[PDB]
Design a protein around this ligand. Structure first.
Ligand SMILES: Nc1nc2c(ncn2[C@@H]2O[C@@H]3COP(=O)(O)O[C@H]4[C@@H](O)[C@H](n5cnc6c(N)ncnc65)O[C@@H]4COP(=O)(O)O[C@H]3[C@H]2O)c(=O)[nH]1
Lengths: 187, 187
C-alpha cells in the first residue's frame, strides 16, 4: 500500500511516546528550577505543521515572527533499553513563552518527528508521494496517532497535538493552548 | 488501515539506511584494524527473524548455539542532522564469525529494528495485530524494504537482507552468505 502514515504513527508511539509520556512530569520535576516554576504546563505539546516542515530551531523561526519563544533548557534524560541494537537516551526541550507583561509560561514543545519521513519522501520520491498525497497523509497520521494515544490510559492528559498552517504564529497558538490547559497555580 | 509495515519500511530507510548504507564502507575504513583485516565483507547484513524477536546480544544467543559469533567492536560514528528535535549519531557492530580452522570472517550484522514495533504491537495490542497478522506483516515489511533499497542506486551492493526462522543457526546462515558475497581477497 501507499498508506505510510499508519506505520509512522504506531512506531512513533511504540518507539518513543509510549514510554516518555507517562514519565515526562516526573522527569521535569527532577530539576529544581522546574519544580520552582509556576505556569509550567507539563504536557508534551506535539507540533504538527500541515506542510511537514520546520526550521530546526523554534525560537525566532518563521513560526515565531514576534520572537516570543525562548529555549530554556532540556529535561533530565530518561534511559530506555529495547533490542540492544542501538542505545537510547530521551530528553525534551523546555521553552519560555512570553505572556505580555505577565509571568511567562514554560512548556514542552517538539515537532512530530515522523513528519520528516513524509517530507523527505515527497521530495526524494515524488512518484511515491505527491504534495497532495502528503497533505492527506498528515491527516491520516494525526487521526491514527489520536486513536493510539487515546487508547493508552497511561498517556491520558500527558500530551496535546497541535496542528497549524505554516502561516500561523506559533506563539499565539501556544499561548491559547497553555491558558486552556488544566494546570492551575500550585498544581 | 492495519498495514503498518509500509510505514515501518519507509521510515527505516529515510530515518536511517538512506544515509548510513552509502557511507558504511568508508566509515569502516577509518579504523586501521578494519583496513588491515581480510575476509571483512563490508555490506550491512540486516537480520529479519520471522518471529520479530531476538536476544539483545547476538554472540552466544539462541541463534548462535555453537558460539561461533563474537563481538569485535564498533565502527566510527557518523554524524547526521535532521529536524533538530534530537541529535543523531550512527554506529554499527562488527562481529567475527568462525570458519573452522580457517581465517575467521568479520562482518556487520544488525537486527531490523522496526521489527521491534511489530513485536511490541502483537504483545500489547493483540486486537490490532494478531500473531498471524504479525507473521504476514514481516513479509510485507521485507518486500517493501526490498523495493525501496533496490530503487536507490547509492544503496546497491551495500546491504543484504537475511530472513530466518528462530530455529536456524545464524552462524551457519552468515557463513554461507559471507562466502557467497562478491568480496575477494584484496578487495
Ligand atoms: N539500528 C538502528 N535503527 C535506527 C536508528 N535510527 C532510527 N532507526 C530505525 O528507523 C526507524 C525510524 O527512525 P526515525 O528516527 O526517522 O523515527 C523516530 C522518530 O520519529 C521517533 N523518535 C524516536 N526517538 C525520538 C526522539 N529522541 N525524539 C523525537 N522523536 C523520536 O520515533 C520514531 C520511531 O523510532 P524507532 O526506533 O521505532 O524506529 C526507527 C528505527 O527502527 C539507529 O541509529 N540504529
Amino acid at each position: 500500500g501507499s498508506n505510510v502514515a499508519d506505520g509512522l504513527a504506531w512506531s512513533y508511539y511504540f518507539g518513543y511516546l509510549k514510554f516518555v509520556l507517562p514519565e515526562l512530569e516526573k522527569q521535569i520535576e527532577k530539576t529544581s528550577k522546574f519544580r520552582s516554576k509556576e505556569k509550567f504546563v507539563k504536557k508534551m505539546f506535539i507540533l504538527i505543521p500541515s506542510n511537514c516542515f520546520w526550521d530546526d530551531k523554534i525560537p525566532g523561526s518563521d513560526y515565531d515572527p514576534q520572537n516570543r519563544i525562548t529555549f530554556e533548557g532540556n529535561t533530565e534524560p530518561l534511559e530506555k533499553t529495547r533490542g540492544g541494537v542501538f542505545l537510547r537516551h530521551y530528553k525534551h526541550s523546555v521553552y519560555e513563552i512570553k505572556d505580555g507583561e505577565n509571568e511567562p509560561w514554560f512548556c514542552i514543545m517538539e515537532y512530530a518527528t515522523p513528519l520528516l519521513t513524509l517530507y523527505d519522501m515527497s521530495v526524494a520520491q515524488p512518484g511515491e508521494l505527491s504534495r497532495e498525497e502528503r497533505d492527506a497523509q498528515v491527516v491520516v497520521f494525526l487521526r491514527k496517532l489520536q486513536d493510539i494515544l487515546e487508547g493508552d490510559r497511561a498517556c491520558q492528559g500527558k500530551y496535546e497535538l497541535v496542528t497549524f498552517s505554516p502561516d500561523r504564529d506559533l506563539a499565539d497558538v501556544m499561548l491559547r493552548k497553555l491558558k486552556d490547559s488544566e494546570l492551575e497555580i500550585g498544581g
